[PDB]
């Protein structure tokens, strides 16, 4: 009858009072990220974010959360990608990701840019989000492989991709998961994540403790560069 909290397996959650229909609808609903501190507070309808403003979960009393809005005017809303549209605001960064990772030249030779941690964190920490356009496995497997550098399977029916133009931070920085390079001794894994803005996607989660400024890597789990590194690793 009072405040309800719906946690997702990934650690994120929706919190607020449910209307007479038992649905997350109102101007005071919020999505709280896995750090249980960063939140998007505002207008939600049936659990879907219409207008969320960056805020901080200051504390909770008997399940009732106390939020404090962060200075600024950036607004966020459910903006699930389509087969051709990656985002309504490609240059609006995700606030949780912004405080945890950054892009820089990779430490891996001839590997282009990489993703690095901004902070020291422990095992199982969500660090970045892998958002992108949604296409079928047939389109990916049928088309020229040279176009599958940023493809990541989401589930049995969808593959996420960050198409050429958008692989440049100057054109797209809403999420940065596609910047993590491959390693056979990775410190992260791709994991399912229910994002309030991106919807069902995958995230980059640490497998263990990582230090500030350490490069984040994941095992792609499969190109020539990969074969070369595999032989070297072996
Ligand atoms: C998902 S992107 C990761 C970010 C990319 N390095 C960039 O600058 O945008 C995949 C591409 O990065 C490179 N990449 C990833 N792991 C690599 C590795 N271990 N060695 C060399 N190149 C790598 C290649 O072009 C590859 O297809």
One-character DSSP codes across 178-196: GGPEE-SS-SEEEEEEEET
- List active site positions: 130, 178, 182, 190, 220
Q: Which residue minimizes the CA distance to atom 8 of ligand 1?
A: 113
Q: How far is the CA of 167 from the centre of ligand 1 (A)?
A: 11
Residue 1 CA to chain centroid, in angstroms? Answer: 32
Q: How far is the CA of 37 from the centre of ligand 1 (A)?
A: 32
Ligand 1 close to Cβ of residue 128 (< 6 A): no
Q: Which residue minimizes the CA distance to atom 26 of ligand 1?
A: 149
Q: Both tokens of residue 56? A: 């901080």
Ligand 1 close to Cβ of residue 151 (< 6 A): no
Q: How far is the CA of 31 from the centre of ligand 1 (A)?
A: 32
With respect to CATH, is domain 1-78 assigned 2.20.110.10? yes
Ligand 1 close to Cβ of residue 47 (< 6 A): no
Q: What angle do CA 134, 192, 212 make, to 5 degrees?
A: 110
Q: Both tokens of residue 97? A: 């990701």
- Ligand 1 pocket: which of 101, 104, 112, 183 to mutate (most atoms within 8 A of CB): 112
DSSP letter assigned to residue 121: B
Ligand 1 close to Cβ of residue 202 (< 6 A): no
- Total residue length of the chain: 234
Ligand 1 close to Cβ of residue 225 (< 6 A): yes
Q: How far is the CA of 112 from the centre of ligand 1 (A)?
A: 6
Write the CB contacts of 114 (distance below 8 Å, at least 6 apart in sequence): 103, 104, 105, 106, 107, 108, 179, 180, 181, 215, 216, 217
Torsion of the alpha carbons at 32, 169, 89 and 203, rounded to the nearest 10: -30
Ligand 1 close to Cβ of residue 103 (< 6 A): no
Extract the annotated binding site for S-adenosyl-L-methionine: 111-113, 181-182, 229
What would the DSSP string read from start to end of 22-65?
Answer: S---EEEEEEE-TTSSEEEEEEEETTEEEEEEEEEEEEEETTEE
Q: Both tokens of residue 220? A: 């792609």
What topology does CATH give the domain 79-221? Beta-clip-like (2.170.270)
Phi/psi zone of residue 36: left (φ > 0), alpha (ψ -120 to 50 degrees), beta?
A: left
Task: Annotate 87-122 with b (16+ C-beta within 10 A) or e (fewer).
Answer: beeeeeebbbbeebbbeeebeeeebebbbbbeeebe
β-partners of residue 76 are: 52
What's the rounded Cα separation, in Å, for the pair 207 and 21? 40
What's the rounded Cα separation, in Å, for the pair 2 and 204? 34
Q: Both tokens of residue 101? A: 């990772």
Experimental determination technique? X-ray
Sheet holding 159-161, edge to edge: 133-135, 159-161, 152-153
What's the rounded Cα separation, in Å, for the pair 103 and 207? 20
Give the domain ranges of the chain: 1-78, 79-221
Write the CB contacts of 205 (distance below 8 Å, at least 6 apart in sequence): 124, 125, 126, 127, 188, 189, 190, 191
What's the rounded Cα separation, in Å, for the pair 140 and 156? 13
3-state secondary structure of 27: strand
Q: How far is the CA of 10 from the centre of ligand 1 (A)?
A: 26
Tell me if 205 sits within 8 A of 186, measured CB to CB: no
What's the rounded Cα separation, in Å, for the pair 11 and 6? 10
DSSP letter assigned to residue 98: H
57, 100, 128, 203 from 96: Cα distances, Å: 13, 7, 8, 12
Write the CB contacts of 189 (distance below 8 Å, at least 6 apart in sequence): 204, 205, 207, 218, 219
Helix residue ranges, H only, the chain: 95-98, 137-142, 224-233
β-partners of residue 161 are: 133
């Amino acid at each position: 009858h009072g405040v309800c909290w719906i946690y997702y397996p990934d650690g994120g959650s929706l919190v607020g009072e449910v209307n007479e229909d038992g649905e997350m609808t109102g101007e005071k609903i919020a999505y709280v990220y896995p750090d249980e501190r960063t939140a998007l507070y505002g207008k939600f309808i049936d659990g879907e974010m219409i207008e969320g403003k960056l805020a901080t979960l200051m504390s909770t009393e008997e399940g009732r959360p106390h939020f404090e809005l962060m200075p600024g005017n950036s607004v966020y809303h459910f903006d699930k990608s389509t087969s051709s549209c990656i985002s309504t605001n490609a240059l609006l960064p995700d606030p949780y990701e912004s405080e945890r990772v950054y892009v820089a030249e990779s430490l891996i030779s001839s590997a282009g840019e990489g993703l690095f941690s901004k902070v020291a964190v422990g095992p199982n920490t969500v660090m970045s989000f892998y958002n992108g356009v949604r296409i079928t496995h047939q389109e990916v497997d049928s088309r020229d492989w040279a176009l599958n550098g940023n493809t990541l399977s989401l589930d049995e029916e969808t593959v996420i991709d960050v198409p050429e133009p958008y692989n440049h931070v100057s054109k797209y920085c809403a999420s940065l998961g596609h910047k993590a390079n491959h390693s056979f001794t990775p410190n992260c894994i791709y994991d399912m994540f229910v994002h309030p803005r991106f919807g069902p996607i995958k995230c980059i989660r640490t497998l263990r403790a990582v230090e500030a400024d350490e490069e984040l890597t994941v095992a792609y789990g499969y190109p020539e560069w990969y074969q070369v590194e595999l032989k070297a690793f072996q």
